[PDB]
Design an enzyme around this catalytic site. Sequence first.
Site, PDB file in Angstrom:
ATOM      1  N   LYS D 123     -28.192  14.961 -13.086  1.00  0.00           N
ATOM      2  CA  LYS D 123     -27.663  15.252 -14.555  1.00  0.00           C
ATOM      3  C   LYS D 123     -28.094  16.551 -14.754  1.00  0.00           C
ATOM      4  O   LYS D 123     -28.879  17.133 -14.481  1.00  0.00           O
ATOM      5  CB  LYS D 123     -28.368  14.320 -15.379  1.00  0.00           C
ATOM      6  CG  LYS D 123     -29.851  13.848 -14.961  1.00  0.00           C
ATOM      7  CD  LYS D 123     -30.652  14.179 -16.324  1.00  0.00           C
ATOM      8  CE  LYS D 123     -30.915  15.814 -16.812  1.00  0.00           C
ATOM      9  NZ  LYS D 123     -31.461  16.697 -15.762  1.00  0.00           N
ATOM     10  N   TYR D 211     -31.254  13.523 -22.422  1.00  0.00           N
ATOM     11  CA  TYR D 211     -32.227  12.468 -22.196  1.00  0.00           C
ATOM     12  C   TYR D 211     -32.457  11.723 -23.614  1.00  0.00           C
ATOM     13  O   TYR D 211     -32.271  10.274 -23.588  1.00  0.00           O
ATOM     14  CB  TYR D 211     -33.811  13.008 -22.025  1.00  0.00           C
ATOM     15  CG  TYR D 211     -33.922  13.227 -20.360  1.00  0.00           C
ATOM     16  CD1 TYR D 211     -33.900  12.390 -19.368  1.00  0.00           C
ATOM     17  CD2 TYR D 211     -34.347  14.669 -20.243  1.00  0.00           C
ATOM     18  CE1 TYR D 211     -34.139  12.798 -18.091  1.00  0.00           C
ATOM     19  CE2 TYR D 211     -34.403  15.103 -18.987  1.00  0.00           C
ATOM     20  CZ  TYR D 211     -34.512  14.068 -17.980  1.00  0.00           C
ATOM     21  OH  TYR D 211     -34.713  14.617 -16.717  1.00  0.00           O
TER      22      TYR D 211
END
EC number: 1.1.99.28
Lengths: 343, 370, 339, 371
Positions: D123, D211
């Site tokens: 990511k 996140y």
Amino acid sequence: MPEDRRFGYAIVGLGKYALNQILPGFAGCQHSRIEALVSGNAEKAKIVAAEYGVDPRKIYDYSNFDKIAKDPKIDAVYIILPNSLHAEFAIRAFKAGKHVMCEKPMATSVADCQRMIDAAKAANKKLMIGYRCHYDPMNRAAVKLIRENQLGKLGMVTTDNSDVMDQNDPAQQWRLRRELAGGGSLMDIGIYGLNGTRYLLGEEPIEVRAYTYSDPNDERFVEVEDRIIWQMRFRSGALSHGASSYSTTTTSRFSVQGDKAVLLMDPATGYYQNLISVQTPPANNQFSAQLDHLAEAVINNKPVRSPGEEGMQDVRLIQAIYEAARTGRPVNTDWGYVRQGGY
Amino acid sequence: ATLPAGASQVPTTPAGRPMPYAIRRFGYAIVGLGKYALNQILPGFAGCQHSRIEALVSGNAEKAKIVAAEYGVDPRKIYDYSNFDKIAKDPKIDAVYIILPNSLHAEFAIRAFKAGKHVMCEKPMATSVADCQRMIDAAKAANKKLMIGYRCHYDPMNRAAVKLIRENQLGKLGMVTTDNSDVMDQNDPAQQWRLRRELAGGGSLMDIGIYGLNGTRYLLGEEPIEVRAYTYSDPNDERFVEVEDRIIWQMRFRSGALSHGASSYSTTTTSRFSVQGDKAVLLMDPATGYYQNLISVQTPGHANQSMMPANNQFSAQLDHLAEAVINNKPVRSPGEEGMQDVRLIQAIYEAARTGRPVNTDWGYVRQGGY
Amino acid sequence: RRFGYAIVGLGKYALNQILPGFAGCQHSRIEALVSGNAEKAKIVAAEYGVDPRKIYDYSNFDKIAKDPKIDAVYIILPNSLHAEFAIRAFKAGKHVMCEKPMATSVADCQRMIDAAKAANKKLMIGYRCHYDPMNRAAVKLIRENQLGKLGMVTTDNSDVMDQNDPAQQWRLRRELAGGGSLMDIGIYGLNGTRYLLGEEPIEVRAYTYSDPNDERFVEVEDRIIWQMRFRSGALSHGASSYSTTTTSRFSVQGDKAVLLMDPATGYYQNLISVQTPPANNQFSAQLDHLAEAVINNKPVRSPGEEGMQDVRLIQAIYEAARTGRPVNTDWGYVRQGGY
Amino acid sequence: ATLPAGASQVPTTPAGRPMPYAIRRFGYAIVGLGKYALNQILPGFAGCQHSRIEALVSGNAEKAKIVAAEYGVDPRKIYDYSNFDKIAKDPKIDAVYIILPNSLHAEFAIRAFKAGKHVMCEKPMATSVADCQRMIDAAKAANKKLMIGYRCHYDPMNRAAVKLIRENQLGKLGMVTTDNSDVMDQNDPAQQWRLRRELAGGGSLMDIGIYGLNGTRYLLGEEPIEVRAYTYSDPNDERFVEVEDRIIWQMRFRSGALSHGASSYSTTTTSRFSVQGDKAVLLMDPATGYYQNLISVQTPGHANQSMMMPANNQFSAQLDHLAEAVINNKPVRSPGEEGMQDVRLIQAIYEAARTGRPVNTDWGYVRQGGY
Ligand SMILES: NC(=O)C1=CN([C@@H]2O[C@H](COP(=O)(O)OP(=O)(O)OC[C@H]3O[C@@H](n4cnc5c(N)ncnc54)[C@H](OP(=O)(O)O)[C@@H]3O)[C@@H](O)[C@H]2O)C=CC1
Ligand SMILES: NC(=O)C1=CN([C@@H]2O[C@H](COP(=O)(O)OP(=O)(O)OC[C@H]3O[C@@H](n4cnc5c(N)ncnc54)[C@H](OP(=O)(O)O)[C@@H]3O)[C@@H](O)[C@H]2O)C=CC1
Ligand SMILES: NC(=O)C1=CN([C@@H]2O[C@H](COP(=O)(O)OP(=O)(O)OC[C@H]3O[C@@H](n4cnc5c(N)ncnc54)[C@H](OP(=O)(O)O)[C@@H]3O)[C@@H](O)[C@H]2O)C=CC1
Ligand SMILES: NC(=O)C1=CN([C@@H]2O[C@H](COP(=O)(O)OP(=O)(O)OC[C@H]3O[C@@H](n4cnc5c(N)ncnc54)[C@H](OP(=O)(O)O)[C@@H]3O)[C@@H](O)[C@H]2O)C=CC1
């Protein structure tokens, strides 16, 4: 320290805070005492008077409240009435020649805050807003280590203050009426996050943004806001984001982020046990310490840490946040407020 | 979407309002307002279900003064070490929690039993086996419960460790290793009772080394039958002129398991237990900390597994005695349990003193299991 | 690739970790093999690409003097046979790399140091942890005083002894292994406490226990615990076990902080941690240390002496556990070059 | 009782000994030998059951050589960016794990798929919502699985938080708070790919705030339909000339839940999530650390009840999850789709911060499989 004496208090409004936190708070006082009570309930006040050993002749109602000017024994008044009523009684108290301890929020409008300050000056009497967190050991300790540069340059503050509102609780009924409360969770508890961000940083916000939402099907929020989120920016470059909630359970969590370390307060502003730690890559109870602070200030004729001006600043900042939330635009708050002897 | 009747009916002009909502059947008298009581214990009450602070006892009035305020204890229930026994007159006081230096434990537990109150006494239980005996007798005579403050007996993590061990997740037990330490003197030599033989009864072993000894015992689920020890302190250190700094002890059990552990007063924070079996090895580190203890399991070939409320030890401990009384049950940390640690610590000093092995198989029986 | 190696004994460490370990060497190569099972030898010599014309055994072993490609020999046989071949190999002009423990007696270790000096060759003992990145880092941070003054060290090394495993079998015989868990794996803790503290133990104490009914420990010992004191005043307690599963944990406590090594001395995945109030694998670094030392006219980090110190310290620990009395070990030993 | 059968029988003289004892059906091709790959991923293979380190792809022969040796990797399976595609040959290579700067993700996910390999990509998925689609399409073509590296999706602690919420322990959700921050090295930032807009595609939000965004989503188990945001950087901090330092975002979900979070590149490490319900409050701190995440549940009246096997194996579990999915015709829990949604939202968030207006995100992204 336990044994109290000098300063005489007149408690106004025998409600949840008065009876659960304040009256019991005298016990640990060194100068403050429960001299009188003001209440629209004879039976209730009669019970409270017997319990705390208050002379039953010292129980005034809201109509004859003013007669307290005839009693030198009464040095100050502690107003613990709904928000909308703070101004009227603080003012009536001053015209009676008494000092005033007023709970937060100071008033339900900025104009009233000012009237209160004007009435105080006019009478040459002190005005103190009931910000218990300003006398809470834990909260002061947090402010200390930040001043002692233990976190480094401050860059991000996060706050959250919440509590589920129960319509059956008398205390929470007026909080759901706009005219009595003057607002929602921001006025009631979000203020702790707003006020803490301010003293934790030691600055004033120069800009504010906000958004508010409430379930249109919830009977509790037909007038006042449930959840509201505000974001602020400071001259130092520090930023913050916090929210208040009237439909989620107890939350009192602050966070200050510096480039050296992060402070965590949680509970940050509760009534009993507050805990704060710092993460890197011996004191009287806030209730008692507050009561005697006004006593000290008056007895020793010295400034109070939570002056009416301070109360005014928060209300004015809350009206700016409400406005931001309303227009969805950032609101300029750089109007030059200055804190008395420090945050 | 209409406002509730209650809210709407609230008047806008000043008006009388009902009595507000009023936002613990076992009372405690806390003895000794020191570091432990003030930082861990008193605050521990907040999470209790049956206990509460009913009175304080302190050799410092002002201290008591402030503290009673913080926690909401009637300022008339602040005793000293003189009128301490007057507590017998107050029926709200169900027990006493002695948190004084080791040397004064027995004296105050006994008086407390004389005042008809149940007793919660910190560890080590006493500075002599005999005072331990005295404490036990005073309790039985007065027909009151005696409990020692082994918080680890009420720490979820530690209990989770005992559980997995008892389910044979580690296999047959062969070797336990413990280490417990902390740096002593903070610029105060003779001002620390812990460094005074007459007050502490011992050094690192009596203060923190006891955690490794007791831990080894409840982890193995058995008593040691033989002991060996060695102690050493830098002779040029004022701190240890009276009590020991570092002491190492080796034990053997009737199952054949062995252990080696040590406590230190001159080394940084350390709380590590280690239990080896023929199937896997358990690792607790922190093993006896105040907030969050962590346990891990390593089986050969597989990776390292961490194991899994998990913290309420202080609260768990306060209510345990409370419940035990209220429900007419046996405490999990009886006086006999404290006397066992004290008796073994005595054997250990003897072993360290003579440099030989000391037989300790006197058949102590852990009531209710470890 | 100027340094050739002659591997003796085709066992676990030999095949499982040493030969595959060459796959990372920059200056070494599996020059030739030595075995008592030509079959297996073939299979092996085959895979790693070894001229089957150099698959000696335990007799013609001497011929090695003939081949000028075979610079040194690496012994991987049981402890009882370490000395024999170390010398048989020295009287051939080949440097030596013996596995730990150096020998089964302090005497033989000396004979081994002599033959080495007579053949003007180098003697290096197989202490992989002396070339393990993680281990060296631990030492570094201690030297940089990150732990403060050292006062307590804890070591534990264990593995379940299976009497049906080849490599294991001789470890159960007194004469072959020359001792139990302390000799075989407990030695890592001993040697570790030493290079971590950066000093030698002056005093030693120990105790040992083994199940009287377990046939695996009729001659050797299962568990032994030893405590030591050093000049500086630091203390240590460790143990080795042959009946509990894998364990490799060292701990070094200072007054400033504590270091945790776990695993401490494994074959891979070694982890270290310090708490306050990209180099080549060990296996390869080792083999290519001997090669480098000889080539650049330099001493070996793991001298034959350093390996003799442990055999002597162990005999002392075995003496201590035998008499239940503390044993003196302050014999002046000086780890030349550093730990 | 005496020495065993075979034990007692051993020539105390040199002799012949039988072959010694012995000691993962999914090869991996780690692309990029950087900090994460080197300190978390590679070491993380240790606890896997099915996954293995089959090949390495580095633009640095030196670094790779050693690394290769360390993990016992075939020194002949050390490719580079030029011949990267050549991995197409070797079948022992089941999939690839791209651990390169953001801007280079799409490119290598695609090339790898054109080599008939499965892809594990860190990511944020890509630097543009566009490239995420190219990646998904590319994968649909070669009939191979695409997985985005959301380890928290495999962290025992995070899964437990998710589980207790689904069991209505917090009650109806109303307010979620997140904060993710770290101090970005302030030494010649022009040399860091996270500080270069074309390589990172954004500042702290793309690197770590994501996140918060992602977590808010699986803790509530729904998608934001409206987003708001603000950002600000010290105009004199050379670190933030192309990417934002701090950014704050507010969101609203169909259930009516709200959330406020931020990410920072100039403040000490932080990873704290909080989920407030009408029944209780959940705090995760650390919430997305590399080792042990801690979760606590504060419930009214009652005290702070921490919630504590295994619980420390997110990397392994993540690596094996890709193995199992293939090995067992099943889809991955972190598909390319799920990664696209975050990049799309992040774009929405960046535009919110720019325009200063709320941005509708009610675009119908369903969570294929569950959060
Ligand atoms: N700073 C802090 O930590 C906290 C401060 N407070 C503040 O204290 C004040 C009181 O709140 P709380 O005690 O929670 O409120 P409650 O409603 O429990 O008490 C209100 C009291 O004011 C009186 N009152 C007079 N007229 C009215 C009227 N029309 N409606 C309601 N009450 C009336 C009553 O006493 P009587 O019946 O005797 O006339 C009444 O009991 C507020 O300003 C609030 O924000 C509250 C909680 C925490
Ligand atoms: N279970 C656990 O995890 C722990 C247990 N303990 C144990 O609890 C007990 C208390 O330790 P801790 O609070 O750290 O010790 P402190 O030295 O901080 O507190 C001791 C207290 O007892 C009092 N006292 C009465 N006489 C004396 C005296 N002669 N010298 C010193 N104090 C005196 C004092 O309080 P006052 O001023 O009110 O008279 C004092 O504050 C010890 O037995 C210790 O071994 C300690 C820490 C942790
Ligand atoms: N430092 C380290 O990490 C390790 C070191 N060791 C050390 O390595 C040495 C090798 O141990 P290991 O490989 O585990 O044990 P093994 O029996 O599996 O290896 C020893 C090898 O030497 C041989 N050998 C020659 N004579 C004898 C004999 N009479 N009895 C048995 N073997 C003989 C063999 O080769 P062949 O049959 O081909 O003749 C053989 O298998 C030991 O000294 C041990 O302590 C062991 C493991 C790890
Ligand atoms: N999920 C998580 O916990 C984490 C995720 N990340 C992700 O992992 C990826 C990389 O992060 P990380 O390991 O920290 O990054 P590093 O800066 O340490 O990694 C860069 C790696 O990619 C390579 N590379 C290829 N081309 C370039 C180039 N133009 N500039 C720089 N490097 C190049 C390198 O390997 P070589 O030298 O071998 O060519 C290199 O070391 C990112 O997508 C990031 O989001 C990062 C940290 C944690």
